[PDB]
Design a binder for this molecule. Sequence first.
Ligand SMILES: Nc1ncnc2c1ncn2[C@@H]1O[C@H](COP(=O)(O)OP(=O)(O)OP(=O)(O)O)[C@@H](O)[C@H]1O
Ligand SMILES: Nc1ncnc2c1ncn2[C@@H]1O[C@H](COP(=O)(O)OP(=O)(O)OP(=O)(O)O)[C@@H](O)[C@H]1O
Ligand SMILES: Nc1ncnc2c1ncn2[C@@H]1O[C@H](COP(=O)(O)OP(=O)(O)OP(=O)(O)O)[C@@H](O)[C@H]1O
Ligand SMILES: Nc1ncnc2c1ncn2[C@@H]1O[C@H](COP(=O)(O)OP(=O)(O)OP(=O)(O)O)[C@@H](O)[C@H]1O
Ligand SMILES: Nc1ncnc2c1ncn2[C@@H]1O[C@H](COP(=O)(O)OP(=O)(O)OP(=O)(O)O)[C@@H](O)[C@H]1O
Ligand SMILES: Nc1ncnc2c1ncn2[C@@H]1O[C@H](COP(=O)(O)OP(=O)(O)OP(=O)(O)O)[C@@H](O)[C@H]1O
Ligand SMILES: [Mg+2]
Ligand SMILES: [Mg+2]
Ligand SMILES: [Mg+2]
Ligand SMILES: [Mg+2]
Ligand SMILES: [Mg+2]
Ligand SMILES: [Mg+2]
Lengths: 296, 294, 292, 294, 294, 295
Amino acid sequence: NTRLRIAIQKSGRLSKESIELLSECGVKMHIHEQSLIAFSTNLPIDILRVRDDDIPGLIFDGVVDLGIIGENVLEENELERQSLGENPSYKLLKKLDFGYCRLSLALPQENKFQNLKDFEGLRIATSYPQLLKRFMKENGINYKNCTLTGSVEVAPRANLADAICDLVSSGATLQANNLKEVKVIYESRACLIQKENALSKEKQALVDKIMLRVAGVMQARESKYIMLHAPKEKLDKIQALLPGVERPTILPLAHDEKNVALHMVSKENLFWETMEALKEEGASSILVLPIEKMLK
Amino acid sequence: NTRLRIAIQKSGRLSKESIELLSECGVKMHIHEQSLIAFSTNLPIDILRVRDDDIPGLIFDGVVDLGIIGENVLEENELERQSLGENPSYKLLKKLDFGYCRLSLALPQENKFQNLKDFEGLRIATSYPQLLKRFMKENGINYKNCTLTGSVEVAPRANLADAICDLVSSGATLQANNLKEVKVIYESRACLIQKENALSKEKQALVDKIMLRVAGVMQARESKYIMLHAPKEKLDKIQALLPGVERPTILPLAEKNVALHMVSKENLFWETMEALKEEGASSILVLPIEKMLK
Amino acid sequence: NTRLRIAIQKSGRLSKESIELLSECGVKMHIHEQSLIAFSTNLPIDILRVRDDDIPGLIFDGVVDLGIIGENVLEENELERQSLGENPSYKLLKKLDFGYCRLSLALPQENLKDFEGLRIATSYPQLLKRFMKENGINYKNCTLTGSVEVAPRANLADAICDLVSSGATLQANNLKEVKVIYESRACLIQKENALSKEKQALVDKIMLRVAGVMQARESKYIMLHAPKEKLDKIQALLPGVERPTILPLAHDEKNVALHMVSKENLFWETMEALKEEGASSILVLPIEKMLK
Amino acid sequence: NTRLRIAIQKSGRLSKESIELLSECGVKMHIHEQSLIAFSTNLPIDILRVRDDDIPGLIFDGVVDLGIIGENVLEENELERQSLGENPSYKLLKKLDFGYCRLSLALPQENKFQNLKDFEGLRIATSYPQLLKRFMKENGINYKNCTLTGSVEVAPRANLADAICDLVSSGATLQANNLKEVKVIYESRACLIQKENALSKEKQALVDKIMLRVAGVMQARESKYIMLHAPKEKLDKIQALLPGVERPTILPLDEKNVALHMVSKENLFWETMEALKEEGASSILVLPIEKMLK
Amino acid sequence: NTRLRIAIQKSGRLSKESIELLSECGVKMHIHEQSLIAFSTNLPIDILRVRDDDIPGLIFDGVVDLGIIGENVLEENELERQSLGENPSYKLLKKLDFGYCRLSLALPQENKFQNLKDFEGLRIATSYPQLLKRFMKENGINYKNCTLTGSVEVAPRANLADAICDLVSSGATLQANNLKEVKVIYESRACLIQKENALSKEKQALVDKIMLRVAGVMQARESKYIMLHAPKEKLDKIQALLPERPTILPLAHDEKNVALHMVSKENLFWETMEALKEEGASSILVLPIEKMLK
Amino acid sequence: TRLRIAIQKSGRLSKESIELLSECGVKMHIHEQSLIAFSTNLPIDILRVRDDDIPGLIFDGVVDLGIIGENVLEENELERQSLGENPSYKLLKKLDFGYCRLSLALPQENKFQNLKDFEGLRIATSYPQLLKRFMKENGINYKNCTLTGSVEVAPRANLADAICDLVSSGATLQANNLKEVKVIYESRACLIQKENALSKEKQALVDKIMLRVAGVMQARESKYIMLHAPKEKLDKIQALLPGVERPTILPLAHDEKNVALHMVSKENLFWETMEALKEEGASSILVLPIEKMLK
Ligand SMILES: Nc1ncnc2c1ncn2[C@@H]1O[C@H](COP(=O)(O)OP(=O)(O)OP(=O)(O)O)[C@@H](O)[C@H]1O
Ligand SMILES: Nc1ncnc2c1ncn2[C@@H]1O[C@H](COP(=O)(O)OP(=O)(O)OP(=O)(O)O)[C@@H](O)[C@H]1O
Ligand SMILES: Nc1ncnc2c1ncn2[C@@H]1O[C@H](COP(=O)(O)OP(=O)(O)OP(=O)(O)O)[C@@H](O)[C@H]1O
Ligand SMILES: Nc1ncnc2c1ncn2[C@@H]1O[C@H](COP(=O)(O)OP(=O)(O)OP(=O)(O)O)[C@@H](O)[C@H]1O
Ligand SMILES: Nc1ncnc2c1ncn2[C@@H]1O[C@H](COP(=O)(O)OP(=O)(O)OP(=O)(O)O)[C@@H](O)[C@H]1O
Ligand SMILES: Nc1ncnc2c1ncn2[C@@H]1O[C@H](COP(=O)(O)OP(=O)(O)OP(=O)(O)O)[C@@H](O)[C@H]1O
Ligand SMILES: [Mg+2]
Ligand SMILES: [Mg+2]
Ligand SMILES: [Mg+2]
Ligand SMILES: [Mg+2]
Ligand SMILES: [Mg+2]
Ligand SMILES: [Mg+2]
């Protein structure tokens, strides 16, 4: 077909945010939970809703054009196919601002953990054998792999393994099974990827247009509009504290020769630490306003 | 009573946004789902929560002062009462910015649709007989009406009708019953209406005050505060692309470009953002507005 | 088509129990909430899932064969069509054992001739009208299709005539139930025009199943010990579907064992009355299916 | 350890019924959704709550004693391991009375299907490549496999395949994606299985005891206690209509009829009830049985 | 008033079963979550739905007639009022068949527990200070009380106490907070209680009637109707396995065996069914009983 | 050591208590079953407890900070005082949530003219101490009936003649045929601290958090305003709009009679103020939200 094909997760932790991103990029569509393919009404785009496990392979095989997938799953599949002698490839278009999670080694609460060497020779249960293997090789630790495709935290209490390597964000399931997180081995986030084989000129131009929108949407979520007063003597430090998307606008203050007004757009979000550092450097009247849309 | 009476939908697609609008207009009230009448604590206003079907009639009969109702239901009921020889009347105060939907003719997926004439002589099932009738009369198409008050999309597969005229927004229920949308006949949105008979001077003044607030609230939702850089050579085009509530503020930059600050009349879609970039605009920032009054 | 068409409520208070009844009558089907027609896999039957409001009309117009509908909605619509000069008709096959509710006049907590001249708000104008005409009371009708209990506090009416089962919504709006005017339950109805012989025979078969399913829910299998001297009184306390089976008890000459199937369910009052008459070892077992 | 280990699905279509069966077999335990091992309080049994996909492998590897799994998943995994040169083995203890589903070939609604040969050379998408392969080999049909681990019904509309081989029970998801079921290739239900390597004498005796309970629970669900009146003349015919677990008890009632008490081997359907009446039976009572043991 | 007043829990672990019991005793009423007092339509009875904490006090003060409350809350409050010099009193009418739980001492998983003496001098956190105190006194153990009205399992990790005394049924919350149950100090269930001061003759007669119904309802839940075949030679052993006198019936054309019909006093567990089979019993049927009265 | 903050586990204050801490830059992972959350970026432990216990934990010095409703705080303070104890604490900040009131209510049918109508009545409440203090202050004798919940049942069930109950909406009162008649106490959530001095390091952390709390609350209330004002009306317009700082006044290019005013309001802008500004000749009034602010 002439229409651009984008694979996203049908249901799971990435689904809502994947749809939201596309929608905020002006891709109008009607999604019914039972329908596995949504057709955009205003753009030549088909959204395929599939299991996240299959997204890397669909992209590697060139059967969809774009995909939104967690880095962890993308790499685990890439490594697996490489280990079977294949040469999977893809283009990473953008690391996205959701799907944050980590892959961590965990042990029974009772165990005494001092360092990574404590895993030497242990049986380790995981749904991510390749990612675990690569990390253990890099650190020169021998172990016995036990692959489980789910319910990984059962393994120690059930004597299937001595430890686990599992995905975590909150920590809940670990506590419930008498386990403690001990070492983060991998950090992941959602990515937007593209198949390796060149698209048609028209499809590629549509991807280019979307990508500009994606960057815009993400940048608007992170960036803030900042207004503050700064002493002229401290301007360079203040700017170093708050990196901007462009050069700051500097305006004279009418009744005041020692200070200036600074208007700028931050590259990153403003945390209280930064607000406090700015005040320490002599900044005052600091205002941070939200931005709904932007385009550099 | 001396208190102003406003009828809104108890529960349904208009309920949340009807309450939100009143709340954003400074009408403080405590609503609980089981209570059918909420009394405003800061203004002399009673909110009656009723079935949307009855709102037009309550207004026509002059028994409430204001109502928020979908256009589709308002006119269907107006037309129905006219067909019984009555003379319903009301004042349309404002078309609102929610309750968007459409009434559409639909056919079985298998049917070949070329033009409206393909509906000649067909049996058409609908919950909106009057709206359908008026549209078919305007376009000179004869048909057989089949009134169903719900589950309209069953009619073709159940051989109650050859086609349907139904409310749609998403399209889901049509696919599930092997139907395709083929012609939009009516587009609807929520409206704020008032009874025909004059109110007391005090009540009318309260309505006037609320109306100004309604316009403000709606404008603040649509309008955005825009900041961008524009080449001086392209300002006229840039301003045409983005109509404003007032004239833009133009500020010199620390050369051949200027800074433009303005308030858009409408919301900024990506197409506009892209058209501005094409015309040479850069550093385009769009900030939300919480309240406004010209 | 050759297939029998049954209209039931898509979603609402009658839906679950309508499907259950058909299912317990051996009508196998797969219902998906979004699908508005279910086809029976084991019988030539189509289930049309519609709004309850339309079921009477579909039956009156002969466009479906059977329907399950609340009596209240059935007669309200019958009366409405009669008032427009039409002559709706149907066959009442069976009053069912669910959908119980009542239509009641209610007044503000603070307050039949007392309704004389009052404004009365209702979603059932025809049923109210018929009742008020029968009792010779003049009133002013106010039709509301929902939220009826708002009317008094909102000064739309002086009283209401509304559907109730629990009473909750009345208390919440400072109203009290004052007079029941109509009692309703779900009914199974059929169109007036004769069916084909094959369709009618299928309906006849279903009807016997419906009766069986309902009787099994009400009837219980009863075993007890009774003194021979009190046997007549005990049998009078417990009407049965058949004559009781009477069995001698080993080594007890004054008493007998009684096994029977009750026509109605056994309430504690009956259990206590049986004990008063000298019955002992009373056992009540549930029945899953029956056919007399 | 001395305790018997049983693997069941953590969450999914088999979970509720797996727990119910064990509970009805007198295995007391407290399951918290977050806890992946439940310890029986009254028997030496550990319930491991896992992903269904892993249950066959845990059994093949002898690392749990019992498992409750769908036949489809069991044989798909058995076949997969055989294709890698392994020799997986297990004992099938009992086919259970839930988890009913089927694996079926399906095509777009528009396609003309006459025979299995119409699948010749087609791309077929499935989560059950091995089961599909075995069936296609048995019937001598060449095809191209496309493995998808979920959302299989997307494949045709997305041009990933020409057809699918997917699990169905209702049919809903097929309609929603413009597909029609065309050929059932495999029928499945939940099974209770055991590892191949011999258990201790104590563990095996516990399994034996549980198995008799499983059979009892399943028979009690199917069997009913029946009481009816039959004419003495029609007696032979009535018994033939109603196969029992034992011979019927016949009791005198007046002189022309008898009372019949019996336990049915199978459940009583309305057809049987109606056949009995036709043969002259009356006062037919069917009572539920909560527990039984032959 | 002339009407009998019964206090039950509005919402919580006892609420559903309290209502069910009354309903199964033929008390017809319409109970809506928003309504705090339900009036029985068929009997002169008012159901007050309150917080369980207050039920003992309402009974002690003679302000309601009956109450359904957990033993633990009843005695905790009794003890508390006694410690303030009051003399609370009540009549225990019946221990009921729901609301089962236990009050248990628990420690961090890491702690070595050998005996009760290990609690000597510890800080113990509990919502049931009086029940804990009575138990620690009866055993001569000194400790430091820490009263928390909820979230008791936080205390050790938060260094508010060294141990806890908390309500448990399913040990979930203990595991989640790295705690282990180590000594049950008190076992509880729901009870039906009555105020001490004599009721009117009419009210007391109504209570008497309800009590017989309560006993009947509970017995019907436990008792089962049993039918089996037994060898005449094993009849005594079989009857000893199954605690009124059984009905013994001859089997037609079988002289070595008899049919036994019994109503069990207790429920039949698999152990008993297996023991019956071991003694030569066969065709064992257990049917449910809906109502009974001796 | 680590700073200990007690908040409500689940209830009306729980969400907003967590949100406030989160908006103050306290990062933490809270799982509903977990009763103690450890901040990942600051030395802070969040204890999730029953609100009833928070005052006592603070009084006893066993946690450092607490977020609790005023009503529960003073009810417990009063209760402990009545047992001869001397509970004490520091009130750090009245917060912008947990708004409710304690009110006397009567059956709808009763005729209420004055507080004296409560003389000698039986009054049911979960807040005996707060009621007692109010009734003593106003010299009214009554009979207390303590109920720990379902207070609105008491009149219809003849447990009392009246109630003193927490309300925000009036829903539950209507449902039980009661009317609110006199507000006796107004409450909101408070952030409190134990009386005994903290270590210098812990106190400095509290000081830092407090400035953040004030910032977060100010950003919720304050708005960024832009408008046009006639030069002749500037003084009146500024009086209508108290600001956090002095307004910035800018000339308008094509217009000599008017100026542009940019400012940050101290309070939120209600329609009344917008309308008053317009009445005074202001035009093009824009109100933008503020996400964070520091003076
Ligand atoms: N707490 C979390 N927050 C954000 N993202 C997460 C979190 N946990 C996991 N993820 C990411 O989301 C991805 C999908 O998670 P999810 O649990 O929905 O996948 P799944 O269980 O494999 O679902 P399916 O296979 O049915 O698509 C993970 O691979 C990971 O990249
Ligand atoms: N998808 C939609 N989005 C927004 N508004 C809609 C949509 N569909 C319909 N509406 C509007 O909302 C009105 C009410 O629809 P809704 O389904 O809430 O009430 P209803 O079906 O009439 O139910 P009831 O009569 O019981 O309140 C419609 O008449 C129409 O004006
Ligand atoms: N407590 C009750 N209140 C109202 N109706 C009841 C009640 N109990 C049973 N019914 C029966 O159920 C029928 C349908 O009630 P329900 O509220 O489901 O339908 P509805 O309000 O007409 O909605 P719809 O128009 O969507 O089918 C009533 O006409 C009545 O016969
Ligand atoms: N309609 C159905 N669709 C799919 N499986 C069904 C159906 N009915 C019964 N089953 C059975 O249930 C088993 C488990 O299905 P389920 O969808 O719960 O697991 P899953 O999708 O593999 O999820 P998980 O991997 O989390 O255990 C299937 O292998 C099958 O044997
Ligand atoms: N696992 C359990 N945990 C606590 N109480 C239980 C448990 N099982 C049964 N109960 C009984 O339920 C009673 C209280 O139940 P529940 O926890 O619902 O009320 P509550 O928490 O005291 O709430 P309220 O005080 O608001 O009524 C206990 O006093 C006890 O008798
Ligand atoms: N409408 C309201 N009703 C009652 N309390 C409110 C209300 N609004 C705010 N609150 C505040 O929230 C506090 C706790 O409310 P909530 O009812 O959640 O706790 P609770 O019922 O005492 O539960 P727990 O004791 O189990 O924490 C009150 O003490 C009060 O300060
Ligand atoms: Mg996955
Ligand atoms: Mg409507
Ligand atoms: Mg209806
Ligand atoms: Mg699976
Ligand atoms: Mg309690
Ligand atoms: Mg509390």
